[PDB]
Paper text:
Unlike the dissociated systems of individual enzymes that make up type II [name] systems in plants and bacteria, Type I [name] systems in fungi and animals are large complexes that integrate the key enzymatic activities required for fatty acid biosynthesis. In particular, yeast type I FASs are 2.6 MDa hetero-dodecameric complexes with an α6β6 configuration, which form a cage-like structure comprising two dome-shaped reaction chambers on either side of a central platform. Along with structural support regions, enzymatic domains form the walls of the reaction chambers, with most active sites facing the chamber interior. The mobile acyl-carrier protein (ACP) domain tethers the growing fatty acid chain and carries it between active sites, so each can act on this in turn.
Here, we report the 3.1-Å resolution solution structure of P. pastoris [name], determined by cryoEM. Classes corresponding to [name] were taken forward and processed separately, yielding a 3.1 Å reconstruction from ~ 37,000 particles, with parts of the central platform resolved to ~ 2.7 Å. Density was present for most domains of the α- and β-subunits, including acetyl transferase (AT), ketoacyl reductase (KR), ketoacyl synthase (KS), enoylreductase (ER), dehydratase (DH) and malonyl/palmitoyl transferase (MPT) domains. The α subunit is mostly resolved, though several segments of the peptide sequence (including the ACP and PPT domains) are missing (residues 96–322, 535–598 and 1752–1879). The β subunit is practically complete, lacking only a small number of residues at the N- and C-termini (residues 1–9 and 2064–2069). We also observed density for a ligand bound within the active site of the ER domain (for reference), presumably a molecule of FMN. Visual inspection confirmed that several domains appeared shifted, particularly the MPT domain. Here, the ferredoxin-like subdomain is positioned further away from the α/β-hydrolase fold in P. pastoris [name], opening up a cleft between the two subdomains close to the active site. In particular, Q171 was shifted within the active site of the AT domain. H749 of the ER domain was also pointing in the opposite direction to the equivalent histidine in S. cerevisiae [name].
Residue numbers in the entry:
A (entry chain A): 821 to 964
B (entry chain B): 1295 to 2063
C (entry chain A): 1 to 95
Write the structure that this text describes.
Amino acid sequence: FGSDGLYSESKLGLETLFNRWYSESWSEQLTVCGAIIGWTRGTGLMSGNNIIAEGLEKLGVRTFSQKEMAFNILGLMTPELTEMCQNGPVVADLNGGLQFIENLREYTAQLRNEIYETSEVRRAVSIETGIETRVVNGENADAP
Amino acid sequence: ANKPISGGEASVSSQAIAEFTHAVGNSCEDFVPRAGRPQLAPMDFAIVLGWKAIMKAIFPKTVDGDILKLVHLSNGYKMFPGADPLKKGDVVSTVAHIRSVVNGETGKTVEVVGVISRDGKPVLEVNSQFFYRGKYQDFGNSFKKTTETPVQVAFKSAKDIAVLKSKEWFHLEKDIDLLNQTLTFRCESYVKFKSSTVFASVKTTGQALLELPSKEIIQVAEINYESGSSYGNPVLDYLTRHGSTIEQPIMFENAIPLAQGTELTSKAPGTNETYAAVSGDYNPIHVNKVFASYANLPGTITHGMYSSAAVRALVEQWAAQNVATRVRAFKADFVGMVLPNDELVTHLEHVGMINGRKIIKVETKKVETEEVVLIGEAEIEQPVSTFVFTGQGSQEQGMGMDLYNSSEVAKSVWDRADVHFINNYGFSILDIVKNNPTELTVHFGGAKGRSIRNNYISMMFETVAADGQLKSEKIFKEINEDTISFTFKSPTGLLSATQFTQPALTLMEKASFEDMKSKGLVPSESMFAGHSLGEYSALTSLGDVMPIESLVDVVFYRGMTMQVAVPRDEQGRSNYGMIAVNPSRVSSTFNDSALRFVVEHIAQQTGWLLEIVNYNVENTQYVAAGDLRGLDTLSNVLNVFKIQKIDIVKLQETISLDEVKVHLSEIVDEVSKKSSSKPQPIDLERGFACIPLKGISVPFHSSYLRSGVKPFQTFLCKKIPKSAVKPANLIGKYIPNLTAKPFQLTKEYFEDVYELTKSEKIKHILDHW
Amino acid sequence: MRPEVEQELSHVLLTELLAYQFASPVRWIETQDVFLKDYNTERVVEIGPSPTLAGMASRTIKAKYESYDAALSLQRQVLCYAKDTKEIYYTPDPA
């Protein structure tokens, strides 16, 4: 996605723990259960990653709410899944099939500029059709 | 009142002119019948000729009111472009029509426009403005038709096109992307009135058009808004708050007073009976005291059109220098009346410019009660002008950069061509001008750098060898598909290189001209020429045949073919050069023919291609170019008979036998031998007449590179297309360097183009109708 | 000629007027005698960075047009864009 600082350099650096589990001495003190957190929608708030989630789900790809996504992580701590991590590290792709959209940066930015540009050409036209009705019918008759 | 009003056929006579100019005091030379030249008539004679048409407009039953309350508010004249004034034996016809019969809180205002037509073609129009006083409620007859101002609207976003397309009055004819482009609206209205603040039937019907980048305008749309019983104009309200008006007058930040140190007093006459006889305005509120007292006036007041015609003679005296053709339009508002025999002073001043014409503002007041009587302004043409454009050899590091930072229209031409230079050629021409470097490396790194390299491999030129023909080779032979960088080197700055000084000089002289033209400082009919490089800068600005992006293309290419046309040696030098000869610094009897014979003598004896390539000043400046050891004899033949001092034989006449072809033969031959003894990197040897032109290693404007014009012709034919040429911007005004006659389309002007070029492109049109 | 065939000849004249221009001598003596003494111009304006040929226009009117400018009593201006910018732009001093 880009323009995120060292966010992707610190999440990718955390993926050495699956190989450092074997090569080091902390196997019986720590168990690794890394989880790929998917496209989680926010709190229903005003976000650019919330407005395009509807058009992103038209491709057959699931986006998650924060209560569905928490149920996925809470299912990684069931006592049969805590036992799986003691035999070796466990990677859980909780990403909802979003890894099959290849042009994902350019497709999502196409969905932002689709939603934003019709927000302008409908607002400015509603403004200019409003102004045009007040020069023809006069400013005297706007009291309703 | 909507049909036009014919005013009949009227003539001009010498008895009508001379009685007119005496009645107003117009003692200009053009209106008095001298011997030799035809007599002219003033613009004020149009209200005499168009009196029967204009005054018939207030008369219909639909435009109602009494003439005894009628006020003449204003009256203006305007001459159509390209029109001569009225002659002595001129016969004219006039057509008038009414524009607006609007009502107000006081009575109604009638606007009448009448044009004068000489032999079918219109010469000038006159628009008046009358005012029936009273209280009127006839709104069924009230109308107003206009031609609205040329608003230009730009569309720099995709919502601006959608706002425009949502309007039902916008009929988009030719579907085209209007993003980052500008439309111009020529709209005209026709309004009926209902109660002086609401309308009855609005009809705005205009057009819209776009300038496409091959110097071409096309209609892209059509405005059609036919409403009724509305309150205002939404078409005009859209163009007001979105676009800006163009073709408007440009006012100075400080006006300048015109007749300084002179009081311009124009005291009203004793009677109004003489002006009423010379104009036909026989209404008795100016001559009869009974009618002037019945119509509630202070007295038998002076004609309003007298006051215009008498103050026009002061503009014709002080703004124009008593020449009538320079007065193109004059309007005046009759605010407050004058009685006969009262003193009044004017105040001429120059407040702005439009289309190269000067806007002189006048203001006439009475000297005693100090109330303003006449407010008007004129449209005095400038003196006849020529814009010459400088060639190469004069270039400074930082030229035009003070104008670049101050003017916004001189910045948008330097910027528009620098974007073209970076994206297509890999350097900045603003970087060259602001600090000329010794080196400049163009890099071909990325995907957009390998496309820049494709522009260097795809430019070709031609030359001849010792024997053979044209070759059609690459200019940059050292640029190929494995080349990652190319460097330009010049040991005396990069403004000294010809391929960088030519697109930097034509850009500055276009930036300089475009700043003047945006201020309204350039006349309509003005000649132009350029010396050696400026004739490309002349017709990109006054000719308007190529845009700024293709101008710098054909002139970077021009200085490139004028660089590889000479076979340079192991260094950057060669055997060809240039010298500047002065036939009166030395050898005080020489003329243009006494030195053209000498350079032809070394052109025939020992050959070597020595000729003169520009005749700048007669007997003062000739710059001749040739090869070294041929050009070195010229600076050591004419430069040696000021020391041993034989004056040449044509001091009075040649002797009756022909020794002049053979007595100066051995002196040019005894210097021809010692030129061969000099080393072939031949030095300059200025002498006393010749100035040693340094940096010019190519014989410009000779016939040595006659062979190279064939790739340069086919390059020009694809950057100056046929539709881009406007003939009226060149005919009779452009003066080339090839044929020093002005540009004309005549069958014997084409002869001199053939006997200088021998081109088959004009040969196969020379033999037709 | 017809107006739609005006610019056909005006194109093919102008390109050959430019193509052979740099391979033919510059006729600058014989064109200063066109915007002087054939079109009696009262102001010449040199658009350039330095007055090289605003200079040589004043040398021409001092050589063959001194009695001609006086007899017709016309006042010539040989203004250049580089240094005469006050009376090019009609912005004089407020005196």
